């Protein structure tokens, strides 16, 4: 399992083992983020497990990850949905294709990514992988956005940045 | 360190080593919770360290702890402010003397407490203790309360419970005034 290093432009130039790649000096690599909603339109919010190298124990959107070499973004979502949440989904739809961001977590671990964002509906029940998720909540998107707007610090900076992009919010909202 | 055990009614009966007292079977003991505001009236919110036995990595109010034998509640507040946050404060005011709290954390660890709540002003700069606090923010109380109502599940349950108590909340509000 690896991450894909990107040069100044989004061109892959090689790979790194996933664990070894997230450091205090993380280099730009390829990733995804997705927001999941159930049949009713509830958003799934998850809390990262305390064993995650980056942002452990942090509340964030439904699922995020690292596409492997030759893997489509959409396949990557599907894979991590199965792996982290044991859940089936509908074809992921683009919500924020040009999201790119760098941030530092409270222990100094950095994420540095070209991270296209997706949305999908779940088609099965969750089956939680507690190596990845320690808690989660099904909730109204409206409420989630309010909490992000009032106390953004309570959420992953990654979730906050995506939810505050005007178009991404529209599309998440239109997603219901 | 230890905790002070309380019987079926809130009366002390002795002490228990602190680690050993916090389990899936935690017996009632004494605790405190305090909400701190800077001169500007902003509230300090903190994120519990990942190594805390109970609610690790969770966003919560300013400071909480366990009074020791011979120690007043208000002295315990002073001490943990100093220990956890490196910070000097004004005399703690009692804002919810009757708060009681029993709850299980994400891993099964139980807290079961008589936990009077306080408010105070910080009088010095912070010196965060990373063994106790992994993150923090200075915030407007209004914003914190709005976030708590919108996504209460993202915060420690004690913080939500205290902030939703009517009389306590009025006291937090009073501490948002700017003071010189
Ligand atoms: C964390 C992010 O920077 C927010 Br987009 C994306 C990476 O996902 P990740 O959860 O870190 O990856 P993984 O699921 O494999 O742990
Ligand atoms: C969390 C509480 O149930 C507040 Br209701 C009391 C425990 O605080 P604590 O910070 O965990 O205690 P300590 O600082 O002494 O370790
Ligand atoms: Mg992931
Ligand atoms: Mg404490
Ligand atoms: Mn990464
Ligand atoms: Mn306790």
From Swiss-Prot, chain B:
Keywords: Cytoplasm, Isomerase, Isoprene biosynthesis, Magnesium, Manganese, Metal-binding. CDD domains: NUDIX_IPP_Isomerase (cd02885). Mn(2+) binds at residues 22, 29, 66, 111, 113. The active site is at residues 64, 113. Changing residue 101 to F: Reduces activity by 97%. Its main location: cytoplasm. The record marks 101 as: Essential for catalytic activity. Substrate binds at residues 18, 48, 52, 66, 80, 84. Binds 1 Mg(2+) ion per subunit. The magnesium ion binds only when substrate is bound. Its EC number is 5.3.3.2. GO terms for biological process: dimethylallyl diphosphate biosynthetic process; DNA damage response; isoprenoid biosynthetic process. One of its GO terms (molecular function) is isopentenyl-diphosphate delta-isomerase activity. Catalyzes the 1,3-allylic rearrangement of the homoallylic substrate isopentenyl (IPP) to its highly electrophilic allylic isomer, dimethylallyl diphosphate (DMAPP). NCBIfam families: IPP_isom_1 (TIGR02150), PRK03759.1 (NF002995). Homodimer. Belongs to the IPP isomerase type 1 family. This is Isopentenyl-diphosphate Delta-isomerase. It comes from Escherichia coli (strain K12). The lineage of its organism: Bacteria, Pseudomonadati, Pseudomonadota, Gammaproteobacteria, Enterobacterales.
